[PDB]
Design a binder for this molecule. Structure first.
Ligand code: FES
Ligand code: FES
Length: 92
């Protein structure tokens, strides 16, 4: 598939709703971060979003740099110098 790209360099906090299905953007191209807007498909990247169903209602931080080791969640990899020096829209 295409390489993923860094969409942003800070996570987005979202209130997840128990029982609701979400589609995390894995490719970095969505203009509705942190979730998929179909860009993965329209641009024929070969990538597709990480579908997940929230088990509890709570605030979470979803990854926008797309380099987390625990997708879909922010694990602080964005805090590395590698990500903070990256250019948005480019691969890490
Ligand atoms: S827009 Fe990125 S995974 Fe769909
Ligand atoms: S935004 Fe990607 S690890 Fe924090």
């Amino acid at each position: 598939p295409a390489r993923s790209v860094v969409a942003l360099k800070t996570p987005i906090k979202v209130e997840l709703v128990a029982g609701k299905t979400y589609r995390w953007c894995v490719c970095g191209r969505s203009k509705k971060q942190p979730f998929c807007d179909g860009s993965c498909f329209f641009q024929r990247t070969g990538l597709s979003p990480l579908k997940f169903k929230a088990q509890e209602t709570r605030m979470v931080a979803l990854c926008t740099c797309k380099a987390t080791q625990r997708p879909p969640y922010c694990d602080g990899t964005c805090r590395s110098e590698r990500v903070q020096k990256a250019e948005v829209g480019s691969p890490l």
